[PDB]
């Protein structure tokens, strides 16, 4: 009858579809890439439809290449890229402006206004965030103020607003459901998180009409059905990381993971209670073992695998993210070069929308390889950067870090990472922790599963990475790292 | 009968040989490239024989290929790379160590000492220089000390020192002559230049035996005979830059040219007076209209052509320096990017030995072309940098700049250059202004010519580049450009 579950994964750079059984075997994976738009430097947008569309095929493609049918699948779980904002016409169902991606820095001006109205605490306090173009509020506004009647219709509930999940579903369900889960909500900067609700302040301050907002639900709950046909349901939602966190089973106080993808997101579960960053981190909403509200401590790094695609597609120093390793090991060292991936400003712990990407310490003998190497390395520095914040904030000492994502395939990387950390790295056996995540939720929200210690056996550690560099070595580098960073901040002119 | 003359060109990267007639038509060019030696990072040497060997090839190689004989050529003008130092066993006639190119930065330590001892002013005052591993003073020393007997023999006038010319000649004349000209001398940082003579201070300070020094002569003068056979004269000696300056016929007060080669050198004649740089420039000895001491304002820029070869040889973004334009033109603008060619530290006006090269304002959508482009652009920024100081010091307004060098072939460049300068650029009909210069001088010396107004014809302007950018536009750029530099300065840790 119904043997499977499908995870949906709307990623910064590609749409994905995953399929799995009760044993949680990942049966099949469809996956179509979409176009990144830089309307202008420090700006990033997506095509909502292209999003949409490319999300719609993976669906099929998967189904279709498994000979699976609408019927053997119970539910549909849903993860997405987290901060990215959409606003569309509702009668009509059409974007009134391209998605603004999280990484996009165009809301900086704004952001500044907020800053000198003493709003930092309220935000920091109610939202758990920080003032930055990262989060949606600003985004939304920006739009508002760029479309003409916008607020009007906004107001005649003529206009609709949502994040990716919210948008997908609206799409799946033709127009039936206008909701979102907490995690995601948590990310807008217009939602009190000791309140689990929209926040008037924000709402007004940002001058956003309550009418374009969606309902806010629990991460694993039945939100409705899709005519896949043959009606399928949707009982899962999360923003990628939190989704990822879950899949990693970092479902109890002090469990942290690091993920490696377009960017970097180090998260650590705070359990029931919300810890407050003192060190540039974020306090957000997570998942309890039951799909119930939990809290986390989050470090968000904007550039990571990304710096690598860059290499590949723009610079074209390589042809394969894959290849980076080889080249990098072609050299002994970075030869003093340092790369700062601030293509979209800085971000945590720094939070500097003006920093821009940079390369340093160039010497006439430096070559493509050094460059390449340097780029990988930047991933690692960055991670440490945040890692300490986490400690600082958490008041914990991780003795191991469990990672995951695309790049962990990179041993050199991995290795180097542990080296600079002075801590061991753990590479799980399975690899789609995020979809693992979104499914569980969805299946958990459906009887398809009725507990985690079930799925608990997939937390196998394939690889263990041990540091092999001494305490000076390390710091020595970190130091030059830090040096380089300073130099990249405040590039942009406000 | 003796229809021609010969220019010898010992360049940083190859030895050349040029031939011409009374109309100064350049008749033939031989040219073997020689090997660069980077003993280690920051270090550069050449094989003094290689240098030698090549040069001769070039010589001969020529005549042969024109069926010209020792008999139809009047003289031999001579030009070379400027700070590069030699020291050889005089009986033996052999180098006691590889040459050390102006380029090389190994005389770093030393420089500092002197720095300590408070000589800036004496130097700046009596040599027209500044402290730096650039000029040979230090160089020599450096050697001295690494070689055992050295100073002894030095002292016993047993050991010989010279610059490329100096050396070259010794070679030509077998051992007969040991002279140098002014311009070149004026480079060593051991020669008073309102004294037209060595400097005891220096000499002692640098701890060098006066013995090993050569006779310092006028640039356009008879120095000896080479048996090429059939005894040919050598009435020409200027440093490739003054050489070029000459060939560009900037032989009177306030005339300047900017050369575009492995580096950049902008020289402005002060006629009969050595004026003091208040702004990071050099006071150096040049050529009056007869081969007679003149003065000049110089801005030396370390990285130019080089940045482009770097591009081609190490980054591999290109295959041809040639190509650089087609690529550059591919994009519309630098995309906010800035490249700082401080592969060797800075240099004029800056003079920062700690500067390291770097790239700036990276954005996810930036690509190799943008990078490339920027690289050329830097070459212009750089030129204005100095242009300004010149004005400053010079107390003059160039309405037109007369360039020359390889790159002047790059239209994009030339044009950009004019646009950023907000000044007109003039590209000459002929292209080896350098050889030119030396061939005059020599022939002049030998009364092969009687006036320059007989070659004032070869000063045909092939192209005039007019600025076509608004003032803002301009300043806008330059600004970012300096932002960059500041950031690049002082990278290296001392
Ligand atoms: N061998 C490798 N070495 C280095 N980086 C690699 C390697 N293989 C993949 N990567 C990088 O990891 C990321 C790809 O895998 P991943 O599954 O994590 O995509 P995702 O993380 O799902 C995403 F962020 F890209 P998106 O939001 O687009 O889905 C890319 O940035 C890619 O460069
Ligand atoms: N078309 C071009 N556009 C840009 N850069 C160019 C172009 N052609 C050559 N280059 C650069 O020009 C330089 C060569 O200039 P040029 O040949 O006139 O001086 P050269 O005498 O050869 C010397 F520079 F080697 P040098 O005298 O410093 O030893 C190189 O460093 C190369 O990158
Ligand atoms: Mg993803
Ligand atoms: Mg030259």
Beta carbon of B347 within 6 Å of any ligand 2 atom: no
Q: How many angstroms separate the Cα of A410 from the Cα of each of A154, A245, A322, B395?
A: 47, 21, 8, 60
> What values do phi and psi take at B454, rounded to 5?
-105, 0
Our CA dihedral for B362, A487, A330, A466, rounded to 10 degrees, sits at -120
Which residues of A does the annotation place in the binding site for sn-glycerol 3-phosphate? 12, 82-83, 134, 240
Helix (H, G, I), strand (E, B) or coil at A281: coil
Q: In total, how many domains does chain A have?
A: 2
Note down the domain range covering B152: 1-248
- Facing residues of A400 across strands? A424
Question: E strands within A288-437?
Answer: 293-301, 338-340, 357-362, 400-404, 424-428
Chain A's closest residue to B338, CA to CA, is: A358
Structure tokens at B28: 């033939």
Our CA dihedral for A110, A112, A116, A117, rounded to 10 degrees, sits at 20
Length in residues, chain B: 494
Would you give the DSSP letter of residue B79? Answer: E
**Same domain, residue pair A284 and A234:** no
- Facing residues of B85 across strands? B100, B163
Distance of CA B284 to the CA centre of its chain: 12
Contact (Cβ atoms closer than 8 angstroms) between residue B425 and residue B462: no
Q: Which among A200, A218, A248 is the end of a domain? A: A248
Q: Which residues on chain B are in Cβ contact (under 8 Å) with A361?
A: 356-358, 491-492
Structure tokens at A272: 């029931």
Q: How far is the CA of A309 from the centre of ligand 1 (A)?
A: 8
**Same domain, residue pair A167 and A180:** yes
CA triplet B235, B236, B241: central angle to 5 degrees? 170
Contact (Cβ atoms closer than 8 angstroms) between residue A235 and residue A220: yes
Q: Which among B230, B248, B266 is the end of a domain? A: B248
Helix (H, G, I), strand (E, B) or coil at A74: strand
**Same domain, residue pair A267 and A208:** no
- Facing residues of B5 across strands? B20
Q: What distance in Å separates the CA atoms of residue B40 and residue B101, rounded to the nearest whole number? A: 13
**Same domain, residue pair A20 and A138:** yes
Q: Could you tell me which of B454, B443, B450 has the C-alpha nearest to residue B23?
A: B454
Contact (Cβ atoms closer than 8 angstroms) between residue A46 and residue A98: yes
Q: What distance in Å separates the CA atoms of residue B322 and residue B324, rounded to the nearest whole number? A: 5
Work out whether strand B179-181 and strand B215-217 pair parallel, antiparallel, or are unpaired.
Answer: parallel
Give the HSE-up count for residue B365: Cα atoms under 13 Å, Cβ half-sphere.
18
Q: Could you tell me which of A492, A94, A105, A452 has the C-alpha nearest to residue A288?
A: A452
Q: How far is the CA of B233 from the centre of ligand 3 (A)?
A: 77
Structure tokens at A56: 């719609």
Name the residue among B343, B364, B483 with its Cβ closest to that of A364: B343
CB count within 10 Å of CB A454 equals 15
Judged on CB neighbours under 10 Å (0-12, 13-18, 19+), A493 is: exposed
Q: Which among A184, A218, A248 is the end of a domain? A: A248
**Same domain, residue pair B215 and B348:** no
Q: What distance in Å separates the CA atoms of residue B170 and residue B454, rounded to the nearest whole number? A: 32
Q: What distance in Å separates the CA atoms of residue A463 and residue A485, rounded to the nearest whole number? A: 31
Mutation for testing the A interface, residue in B364, B366, B476 having most A CBs under 10 Å: B364
CA triplet A307, A313, A319: central angle to 5 degrees? 100
- A453: domain CATH number is 3.30.420.40
**Same domain, residue pair B254 and B340:** yes
CB count within 10 Å of CB A133 equals 25
Structure tokens at A418: 């542990």
**Same domain, residue pair A166 and A286:** no
Q: What distance in Å separates the CA atoms of residue B371 and residue A175, rounded to the nearest whole number? A: 47
> What values do phi and psi take at B487, rounded to 5?
-60, -35
Would you give the DSSP letter of residue A269? Answer: E
Q: How many angstroms separate the Cα of B383 from the Cα of each of B335, B417, B447, B481?
A: 21, 8, 37, 12
Query: Could you give the residue ranges of the DSSP H alpha helices within A249-395?
Result: 305-310, 324-330, 368-390
Structure tokens at B412: 């994009």
Judged on CB neighbours under 10 Å (0-12, 13-18, 19+), B377 is: buried
Give the HSE-up count for residue B399: Cα atoms under 13 Å, Cβ half-sphere.
0
**Same domain, residue pair B84 and B163:** yes
Q: How many angstroms separate the Cα of B299 from the Cα of each of B63, B258, B423, B434, B436?
A: 36, 9, 18, 17, 22
| CB–CB contact A360 B358 (8 Å) | yes
**Same domain, residue pair B155 and B190:** yes
Q: Which residues on chain B are in Cβ contact (under 8 Å) with A487?
A: 487
Q: How far is the CA of A262 from the centre of ligand 1 (A)?
A: 6
Q: What distance in Å separates the CA atoms of residue B390 and residue B404, rounded to the nearest whole number? A: 18
| CB–CB contact B368 A343 (8 Å) | no
Q: What distance in Å separates the CA atoms of residue A29 and residue A59, rounded to the nearest whole number? A: 9
**Same domain, residue pair A130 and A149:** yes
Helix (H, G, I), strand (E, B) or coil at B340: strand
How determined?
A: X-ray
Distance of CA B301 to the CA centre of its chain: 10
**Same domain, residue pair A243 and A344:** no
Contact (Cβ atoms closer than 8 angstroms) between residue B338 and residue B480: yes
Q: What distance in Å separates the CA atoms of residue B319 and residue B327, rounded to the nearest whole number? A: 11
- Tell me: cis bond preceding A460? Omega within 30 of 0 counts: no
Q: What distance in Å separates the CA atoms of residue B218 and residue B196, rounded to the nearest whole number? A: 10
Q: Give the largest Cα separation in chain B, rounded.
A: 67
**Same domain, residue pair A300 and A243:** no
Q: What distance in Å separates the CA atoms of residue A265 and residue A359, rounded to the nearest whole number? A: 23
Contact (Cβ atoms closer than 8 angstroms) between residue B260 and residue B408: yes
Resolution, given in Å to one decimal, reads: 3.0
Instruction: Give residues with Cβ within 8 angstroms of A33, minimum separation 6.
Output: A13, A14, A15, A54
């Amino acid at each position: 009858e119904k043997k499977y579950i499908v995870a949906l994964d709307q990623g910064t750079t590609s749409s994905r579809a995953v399929v799995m059984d009760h044993d949680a075997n990942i049966i099949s994976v469809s996956q179509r890439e979409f176009e990144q738009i830089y309307p202008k430097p420090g700006w990033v947008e997506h095509d909502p439809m292209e999003i949409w569309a490319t999300q719609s095929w993976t669906l099929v493609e998967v189904l279709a290449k498994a000979d699976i049918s609408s019927d053997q699948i119970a539910a549909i779980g849903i993860t997405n890229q987290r901060e990215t904002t959409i606003v569309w016409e509702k009668e009509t169902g059409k974007p009134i402006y391209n998605a603004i991606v999280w990484q996009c820095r165009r809301t900086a001006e704004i952001c500044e206004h907020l800053k000198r109205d003493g709003l930092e605490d309220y935000i920091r306090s109610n939202t758990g965030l920080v003032i930055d173009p990262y989060f949606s509020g600003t985004k939304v506004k920006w739009i508002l103020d760029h479309v003409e009647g916008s607020r009007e219709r906004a107001r005649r509930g003529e206009l609709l607003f949502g994040t990716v999940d919210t948008w997908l579903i609206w799409k799946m369900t033709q127009g039936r459901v206008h909701v979102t889960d907490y995690t995601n909500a948590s990310r807008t900067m217009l939602f009190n998180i000791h309140t689990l609700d929209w926040d008037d302040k924000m709402l007004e301050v940002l001058d956003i009409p309550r009418e374009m907002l969606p309902e806010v639900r629990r991460s694993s709950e039945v939100y409705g059905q899709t005519n896949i046909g043959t009606r399928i349901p949707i009982s899962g939602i999360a923003g990628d990381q939190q989704a990822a966190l879950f899949g990693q089973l970092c479902v109890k106080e002090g469990m942290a993971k690091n993920t490696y993808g377009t960017g970097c997101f180090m998260l650590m579960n705070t359990g029931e209670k919300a810890v407050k960053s003192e060190n540039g981190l974020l306090t957000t909403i997570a998942c309890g073992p039951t799909g119930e509200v939990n809290y986390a401590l989050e470090g968000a790094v904007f550039m990571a695998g990304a710096s690598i695609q860059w290499l590949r597609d723009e610079m074209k120093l390589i042809n394969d993210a894959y290849d980076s390793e080889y080249f990098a090991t072609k050299v002994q060292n970075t030869n003093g070069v340092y790369v700062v991936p601030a293509f979209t400003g800085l971000g945590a712990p720094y939070w500097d929308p003006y920093a821009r990407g940079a390369i340093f310490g160039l010497t006439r003998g430096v070559n493509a390889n050094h460059i390449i190497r340097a780029t990988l390395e930047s991933i690692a520095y960055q991670t440490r950067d945040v890692l300490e914040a986490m400690q600082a904030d958490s008041g914990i000492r991780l003795h191991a870090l469990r990672v995951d994502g695309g790049a962990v395939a990179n041993n050199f990387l991995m290795q180097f990472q542990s080296d600079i950390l002075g801590t061991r790295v753990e590479r799980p056996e399975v690899r789609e922790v995020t979809a693992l995540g979104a499914a569980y939720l969805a299946g958990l929200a459906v009887g398809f599963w009725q507990n985690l210690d079930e799925l608990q056996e997939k937390a196998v550690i394939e690889r263990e990475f041990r540091p092999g560099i001494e305490t000076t070595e390390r710091n020595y580098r970190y130091a030059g790292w830090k040096k380089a960073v300073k130099r990249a901040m405040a590039w942009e002119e406000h």
